[PDB]
Design a binder for this molecule. Structure first.
Ligand SMILES: Cc1ccc2nc(C(=O)NC3CCCC3)cc(Nc3ccccc3)c2c1
Lengths: 202, 206, 229, 214, 218, 219, 204, 229, 206
């Protein structure tokens, strides 16, 4: 499993693979590792799939309740704080979940990483999962704030591809989302082998 | 313990510095994460530990201090009172079901007369805090792998009447020593100071 | 520990050894493992002394109140059920083997075995303790059902003596109690008057020939008991 | 003593255009003996259009089936007799599997049925309820033997040839019969007979397929 | 106190269930005169392999439930299927509380013509078949019972079922360490369940290869 | 694995299954477990296949050398002694449970050798994971001085008991009859599990799999 | 485990007068792909092709030992070793280290150049042989390879049909395996010629 | 496993059960645990079958060569010493309890016990195996030294029957061999003709009253053996 | 594993780099320790591991190569031969009493025609070596915590026909990535190269 998300002048880019491997056997190649919390917030799948799915569904329910009670959308700082509080309450219950909350509230774009022990960090670039060690090498080398939307999407897709090429636990279909002020759009969904033939032609 | 925090108190100020390291195993997640939390206008804590417990403990302490200020009509608490409150929290944690806070603290502050009737502490205050609930007033203190490396250095070089610039140079030397002798990469050190005017974020030393 | 209970036509006879041992040292050599529940119902206790004592005291307290409530006597089955329930609810925390034996006017003499597992079996005779393992083949060969009261008491004493002659965890006094329609009668016979022990057995008088004298022949001629000889 | 026990067996579902083919091997075995060759507890009907299939512990799936049935009956009571849909039952299964996250059921489940448009859908779960939809799926002891075969014949990857037309009920049933026949000859814990449930809008039909008894 | 193996087979007209009358305490054959088959209701019978205390408590709980329900309300007596369902649910509930009923139970019953035979584990596994066995009877007797059933799928007569049951008991006595040559067979038929008196099977120990000189290791 | 041996009127009948399991998966469906030891001695094996094959081959070679030296026919007791000494020398780490059957001038000889080296000479024996279900059959139908047909049918039935009640056994019954003069080994004596529901045989025309480089080397 | 540390899978399949032996290309360290161009096949002579699977260092050491043994055999015995003799020699070599076992699992295919009979073998790590008449397979994707071969193989295949079946089975088995993949390499050995082919696979 | 040896005036009688059991399954029910060492010397083996078989074969090989070397017979003490040495040098790797009993013209009939520890004790009678624990009190009560040959054989068979009636690891045939100045004579009696078993014992015929019928009284009236009754 | 070694082979050269870290359980003993041992005139090995086994293995291999050159009258061994010799040594170690060499190797070399009759390899050679005795010819290879970080980077940027200066820039990027993403401080990287003229110690990249 390899996931990445970075902040640039133009919003946030999120990118995922689609492989779930129960040890050595490949369980599935169509897993959705981007969890659409709402039409304005995005979450990521890493670690225990059931834990992430259930708790980000809980987070989406709490965000909808926040909107209903208060008449306005929740901020990403508050949404990430809810997940972090929930996770910290269960830090001794053996949860396994590493997620990223990316959104565009009234204070611009914002990205948080929340682990399974209640940690909640706010930086402009994260890579999560067993393939992150391969993404960072491609991602830290080409990342810059003044990237175009197309350039940022290309960088994220290339980093995820290079993660899937060397990591046995990562693979499937590379999916790229872009979070902007109007919400998020699924930018792309491309097969990894076709990505290899596109990048390394001939 | 991987991240080193340094603090030393002088005649007119206390300087603290905290490594900004965050890691998942051997991977450096980030190297710029502020681990110095300002509790009051003239109080702060430099905390070492993993993000969850550290953030929860600091936010709990800060929220309780703010609530006390609200219920006491803006009466600011002394450094000793806040330090004892943190110590009581940490000591209560180690005998609770949820377990102890895996956070080591250097609490710095400056005491000012709250009113004309006040006759308490006026200089700067520094406190060393273990995760088990130990509290000790020290002229200087350190946490992390580099702590000992700094401590002897301070024993060699610290003076009670150091100036702000000479204190800045001393903190730069301590951070350089930590970078030189610790295998764990602490590239950035997030230095802040407490003076009679409050908390200042010092960017010269890092 | 050796405990047993045998039913005859009138009632029951309960027999036990007197030895509480901390592994290999005798902490007590005059124990009383026949514990009174009611006037005509007793229990033989084996295993943890504290657990069995607490169980017996609680059951006796429960039975004493029950007599006052109903205004009549208690059957042996009621005490057996009380021990069975209390030992089954605590089977993982206690180490106890119980024999519940007594007389009631309705069912005559009754004997119940409640092993460590917590079951309850109604039997003509019951054995328990570390020394009981030596008595099973003793009962299969020498025990005939339908003995008289005195015959049953004598057989129980002989069985207990044979049991602790071989069991290191058992020994000391032999305590028996007879429970029937008449007044219950107890008896304590000491070790020096025991019906059997290997020390007085004539077939174990001759010592094994282990310390051969240095000889010029392969003929075995007894142990060497003298320096000159 | 352990509160868990694996009884073996394998299930497999393939979702068609307007049908679902569910299948489960009827074989229940204990420690090393064989409890029965005619165990029908693996496949359970929840609604006339939704079925569940479980592998692993038999007692755990019996309990889970009872819980699902009573939750569905409560839903019918609370929604004016409206029977829950396949996706609602899938989400409920995920939620209830996760509720027992600290003492998990020893079951690997699949929820199959028809969509609102009538097109067949399959859902697969882990022990703690990680749901994932798909068009086919195999669970149990022989999953690793038949899942790659379904991958090759359905996805038709690494084939420089035009994709054949989409399979009907008969061709899907024949393919699944071949998959179970191949699994029963190489996996020692599966195979006495396979129960097939063909779920369409015009009711559900049941069929029984013979396998080897060794 | 632990019980040995239990076997049971359905014949054309009822069910037969055989078990030895022995409770052992480890390797010690402690009690050879124990009636292990217990009658539940007026239609069913049960016998458990394993712990005898747990079987005693569970049988008491099941028998109290039937009689009290029949007595308190003007209702029909529970069917054997319903009794076995209650038994299975109780066993599973004990398992989920981490206080299991460490027994493997064979359950038989007949009511108004329909015959019911089933088995349940200590952890909640349940199954129904035409032949059930627990303990070493599952590995020893059960293959012979299945072969006898499959040599005539129209159904076994009572005599044919009894013959193969006695053959399985003889083999169990040959090959099971904690067993005795004293068995009881309960017959569940339309009129009700009837437990027979204890009996023994005839054994053979006079094979020419069993002699002292052929088995000697010189 | 289920291996069975029976002493009948004149000779020994051995039987085995043919399924070899590569750790809960069927590797080969027609494995051979009745091994050659001598012209008059055979040995079925159960347990670690490598250990059984190695020990049987070594003892058979030793017996062949010994018959070259002496000029007589090998005695079953000699093979039994060699096998038991070798198995005891390794304290059971050579995990091979053997059923040895032969005929000598002293008559039929059937025995079992445990992996630890203990031996038991008996008229009828079973070994393997499905041995118990096999033994229950032998205890139910064995009688002294059976004919060859009765012994063969009893061995086949006992093997089938392990075939259907043990997941590690099946797919055939191998039967070997050893007499004073002749030793016959039937492989397909009983095939209860036949081939049902034949394959679809879906065709893949040559060229459906893309090839990156190709090299042809004529010989 | 040690056998799955390096990944890799090999499978041999029997035609009429031919056999196809195919190996994956991946070499890795328990999750991480060191190289994607490491076939596991070895040619002994014009008739025998065998592959090794397991710990890669053990694969290389055992291959060197086998090369030494076959060269010595061809020097002493003025002839090429046969498939059955080669398999027996591997069995003996593996059983010599019965308590210090090598972590390989060979897959041997051979054909008689004069007769045309096809011999397949696949031993365990201690040499326990296995000689069926349809196919053998070893590696991390052994279960999937077994399933695909059981579902696709038929007795009377042509070299081209056998190659297509082997390629499809290998690719489909590697798709479900995280420790195997990155294309394949196949060798079709007939009575008259030997062909080597490289088969496209996923780069995952 | 139940093994024993008893000395009478002429020689010795060795008795054993026939049951090799893998814990709870009977692997062999016609074992022969009386292993020939010389013509007049035998051993009873208990414990690990492979270890005891190897020990007996090695000792028999050693003794057979010794007879040829010295040109005379072997005393029972020599075989006892051989087993004692071989069991003491391997006491940590083997599980074996040996009884060495036989006749020699010099010392008459001799019985030696070599337990798992590796010691050697010369005794009038010796017991061994899991079932021996049931026989000690049987010998203390029913065994009288000085019996005749037939009396000794009958007593040994009765003791073995009583031992495996209670021991689950023992059972099957009873094998006895008599060794004296005459020709050694063996005997194998089957279980259906055994001198004792609990199945034929009249005092265990009546079943324990466990399955009470539902009744309006506390009177115990037997087990419920019918649905109607 | 704490220390990261990088290597990549181009058309006319092979560049290797080895971190100079030496530590005692969290203490940086030194950061400038050359872990690249030159075996022959055109051969070298970059070895990761603790000092003892690494030094012993490299000295053993170098001494054996020198002895072979002496006994073969100055005949230099090919890169494949030396790599196979090292692989045989490592594989023999893992089944020996003294245990396996806890050393991971990147073996680099340049093959030149030893005589006019030579018809072997002429370009550069690079070999990845695991401590268990694995040997694999690779275009580039890496060891240590940062290895994966570099590998993908190389997969993104490596080309077969890179020049010396562009290769130097690529190695600088790889070292920067290791310093950026690994918590273990690898400040200095000890870069060397093998070309047709032999071994050069490159000081520009560190
Ligand atoms: C910000 C961040 C960076 C790297 C992360 N790396 C791994 C990870 O598994 N790395 C592998 C093991 C060591 C090298 C490869 C896991 C992470 N979060 C996480 C994922 C799932 C559950 C809990 C936490 C990360 C988060």
């Amino acid at each position: 499993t390899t996931t990445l998300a970075f902040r640039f002048n133009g919003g946030i880019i999120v990118a995922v693979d689609s492989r779930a491997s129960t040890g050595q056997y490949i369980a599935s190649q169509t897993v959705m590792k981007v969890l659409e919390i709402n039409d304005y917030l995005l979450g990521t799948l890493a670690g225990g799939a059931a834990d992430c799915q259930y708790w980000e569904r809980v987070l989406g329910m709490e965000c909808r309740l926040w909107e209903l009670r208060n008449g306005s959308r929740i901020t990403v700082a508050a949404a990430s704080k809810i997940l972090a509080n929930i996770t910290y309450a269960y830090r001794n219950h053996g949860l396994s979940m590493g997620t990223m909350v990316a959104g565009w509230d009234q204070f611009g774009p914002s990205l948080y990483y929340v682990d399974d022990k209640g940690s909640r960090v706010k930086q402009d670039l994260f890579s999560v999962g067993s393939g992150s060690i391969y993404a960072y090498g491609v991602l830290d080398t080409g990342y810059r704030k003044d990237l175009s939307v197309e350039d940022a999407c290309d960088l994220a897709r290339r980093s995820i591809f290079h993660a899937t090429y060397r990591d046995g636990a990562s693979g499937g279909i590379v999916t790229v989302y872009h979070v902007h002020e109007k919400g998020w759009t699924k930018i792309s969904r491309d097969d990894q082998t076709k990505l290899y033939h596109r990048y390394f032609p001939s | 313990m991987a991240e080193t925090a340094i603090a030393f108190r002088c005649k007119d100020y206390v300087m603290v510095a905290a490594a900004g390291l965050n890691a998942f195993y051997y991977i450096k997640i980030t190297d710029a994460e502020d681990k110095i939390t300002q509790l009051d206008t003239h109080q702060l804590v430099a905390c070492t530990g993993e993000n969850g417990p550290r953030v929860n403990f600091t936010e709990y302490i800060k929220c309780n201090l703010a609530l006390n200020r609200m219920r006491q009509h803006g009466r600011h608490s002394s450094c000793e009172s806040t330090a004892n409150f943190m110590r009581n929290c940490l000591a209560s944690a180690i005998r609770s079901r949820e377990g102890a806070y895996q956070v080591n603290c250097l609490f710095a502050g400056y005491d000012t007369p709250v009113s004309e009737d006040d006759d308490g502490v006026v200089g700067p205050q520094l406190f060393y805090m273990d995760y088990l609930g130990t509290l000790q007033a020290v002229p200087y203190g350190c946490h992390g792998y580099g702590a000992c490396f700094v401590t002897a250095l301070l024993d060699r070089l610290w003076r009670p009447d150091l100036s702000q610039q000479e204190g800045l140079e001393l903190m730069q030397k301590c951070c350089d020593e930590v970078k030189r002798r610790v295998i764990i990469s602490n590239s950035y050190f997030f230095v802040k100071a407490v003076t009679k005017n409050g908390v200042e974020v010092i960017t010269a030393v890092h | 520990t050796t405990i047993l209970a045998v039913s005859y036509n009138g009632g029951v006879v309960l027999a036990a050894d007197s030895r509480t041992s901390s592994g290999t040292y005798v902490v007590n050599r005059a124990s009383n493992k026949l514990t009174k529940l009611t006037k005509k119902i007793y229990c033989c206790r084996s295993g943890s002394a504290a657990d069995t004592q607490a169980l017996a005291e609680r059951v006796s307290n429960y039975l004493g109140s029950y007599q006052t409530d109903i205004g009549a006597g208690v059957n042996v089955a009621t005490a057996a059920n009380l021990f069975q329930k209390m030992c089954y609810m605590n089977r993982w925390n206690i180490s106890a083997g119980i024999i519940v034996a007594g007389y009631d006017p309705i069912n005559g003499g009754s004997v119940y075995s409640i092993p460590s597992g917590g079951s309850c079996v109604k039997l003509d005779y019951a054995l328990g303790g570390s020394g009981s393992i030596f008595l099973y083949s003793f009962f299969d060969a020498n025990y005939k059902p339908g003995m008289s009261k005195s015959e049953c008491v004598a057989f129980c004493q002989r069985a207990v003596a044979h049991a602790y002659s071989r069991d290191g965890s058992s020994g000391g006094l032999i305590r028996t109690i007879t429970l029937d329609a008449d007044e219950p009668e107890d008896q304590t016979i000491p070790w020096n008057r025991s019906p059997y022990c290997m020390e007085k057995d004539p077939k174990y008088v001759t010592q094994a020939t282990q310390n051969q004298p240095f000889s010029s022949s392969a003929k075995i001629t007894g142990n060497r008991m003298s320096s000159t000889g | 003593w352990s509160p868990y026990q694996d009884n073996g067996g394998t299930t497999a579902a393939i979702a068609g255009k307007d049908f679902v083919i569910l299948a489960g091997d009827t074989r229940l075995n204990g420690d090393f003996c064989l409890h029965s060759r005619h165990d029908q507890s693996k496949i359970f009907q929840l609604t006339p259009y939704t079925y569940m299939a479980s592998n692993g512990m038999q007692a755990d799936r019996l309990q889970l089936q009872q819980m699902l049935k009573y939750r569905v009956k409560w839903y019918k009571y609370n929604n004016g007799g409206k029977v829950p849909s396949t996706k609602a039952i899938a989400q409920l299964m995920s939620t209830m599997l996760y509720h027992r996250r600290f003492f998990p059921y020893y079951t690997f489940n699949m929820v199959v049925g028809l969509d609102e448009e009538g097109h067949g859908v399959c859902y697969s779960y882990d022990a703690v309820g990680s749901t994932e939809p798909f068009l086919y799926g195999t669970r149990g002891s022989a999953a690793s033997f038949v899942e790659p075969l379904l991958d090759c014949l359905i996805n038709r990857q690494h084939m420089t040839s035009q994709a054949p037309p989409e399979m009907t009920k008969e061709e899907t049933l024949a393919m699944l019969k071949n998959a179970f026949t191949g699994a029963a000859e190489r996996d020692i814990y599966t195979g006495d007979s396979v129960s097939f449930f063909i779920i369409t809008k015009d009711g559900v039909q049941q069929e029984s397929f013979e396998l080897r008894k060794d | 106190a632990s019980g040995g193996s239990v076997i049971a087979i359905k014949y054309k007209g009822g069910v037969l269930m055989a078990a030895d009358t022995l409770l052992s305490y480890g390797s010690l054959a402690k009690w050879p005169n124990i009636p292990r088959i217990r009658l539940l209701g007026s239609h069913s019978a049960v016998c458990a392999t394993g712990s005898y205390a747990d079987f005693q408590m569970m049988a008491k709980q099941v028998e109290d439930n039937i009689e009290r329900q029949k007595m308190y309300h003007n209702v029909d007596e529970l069917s054997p299927s319903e009794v076995f369902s209650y038994l299975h649910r109780s066993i599973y509930q004990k398992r989920c509380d981490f206080d299991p009923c460490l027994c493997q139970m064979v359950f038989i019953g007949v009511r108004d013509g329909e015959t019911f035979l089933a088995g349940v584990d200590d952890v909640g596994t349940r199954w129904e078949d035409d032949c059930i066995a627990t303990g070493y009877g599952a590995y020893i007797a059960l293959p012979l019972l299945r072969q006898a059933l499959e040599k005539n799928p129209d159904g076994l007569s009572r005599g044919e079922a009894m013959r193969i049951l006695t053959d399985c008991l003889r083999v169990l006595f040959y090959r099971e360490c904690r067993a005795i040559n004293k068995f009881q067979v309960a017959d569940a038929a339309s009129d009700g369940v009837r437990i027979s008196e204890p009996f023994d099977v005839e054994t053979h120990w006079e094979y020419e290869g069993y002699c002292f000189e052929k088995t000697a290791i010189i | 694995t289920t291996i069975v041996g029976v002493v009948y009127r004149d000779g020994v009948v051995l039987g085995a299954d043919t399924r070899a399991t590569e750790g809960s998966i069927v590797a080969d469906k027609r494995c051979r477990k009745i091994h050659y030891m001598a012209p008059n001695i055979m040995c079925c094996g159960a347990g670690t296949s490598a250990d059984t094959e190695a020990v049987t081959n070594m003892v058979s070679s030793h017996l062949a050398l010994h018959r070259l030296e002496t000029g007589k026919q090998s005695r079953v007791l000699e093979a039994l002694t060699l096998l038991k000494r070798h198995l005891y020398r390794y304290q059971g780490h050579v995990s091979a449970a053997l059923v040895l059957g032969g005929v000598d001038v002293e008559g039929p000889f059937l025995a079992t050798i445990a992996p630890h080296g203990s031996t038991d000479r008996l008229p009828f024996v079973t070994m393997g994971s499905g041995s118990i279900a096999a033994m229950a059959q032998l205890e139910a139908a064995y009688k002294d001085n059976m004919t060859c047909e009765e012994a063969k049918e009893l061995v086949a039935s006992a093997i089938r008991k392990g075939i259907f009640n043990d997941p590690y056994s099946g797919t055939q019954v191998d039967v070997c009859v050893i007499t004073k003069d002749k030793t016959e080994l039937t492989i397909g004596y009983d095939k209860p599990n036949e081939r049902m529901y034949p394959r679809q045989e879906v065709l893949l025309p040559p060229g459906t799999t893309p090839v990156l480089k190709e090299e042809i080397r004529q010989l | 485990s040690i056998m799955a540390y390096s990944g890799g899978s090999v499978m041999a399949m029997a035609g009429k007068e031919c056999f196809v032996i195919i190996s994956d290309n991946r070499l890795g360290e328990q999750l991480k792909t060191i190289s994607t161009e490491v076939p596991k096949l070895h040619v002994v002579n014009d008739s025998i092709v065998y592959g090794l699977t397991g710990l890669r260092t053990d694969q290389q050491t055992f291959a060197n030992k086998v090369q030494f043994r076959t060269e010595m055999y061809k020097l002493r015995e003025e002839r090429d070793i046969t498939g059955k003799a080669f398999a027996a020699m591997i069995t003996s070599m593996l059983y010599e280290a019965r308590f210090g076992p090598w972590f390989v699992e060979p897959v041997i295919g051979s054909i008689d150049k004069s007769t045309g009979e096809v011999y397949l073998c696949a031993t365990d790590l201690i040499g326990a042989p296995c000689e069926p008449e349809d196919y053998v397979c070893a590696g991390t994707a052994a279960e999937s390879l077994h399933g695909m071969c059981e579902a696709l193989w038929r007795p009377g295949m042509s070299p081209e049909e056998l190659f297509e079946i082997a390629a499809q089975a290998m690719l489909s088995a590697c798709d479900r395996d995280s420790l195997s993949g990155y294309g394949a390499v196949a060798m079709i050995v007939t009575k008259d010629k030997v062909t080597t082919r490289l088969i496209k696979g996923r780069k995952d």
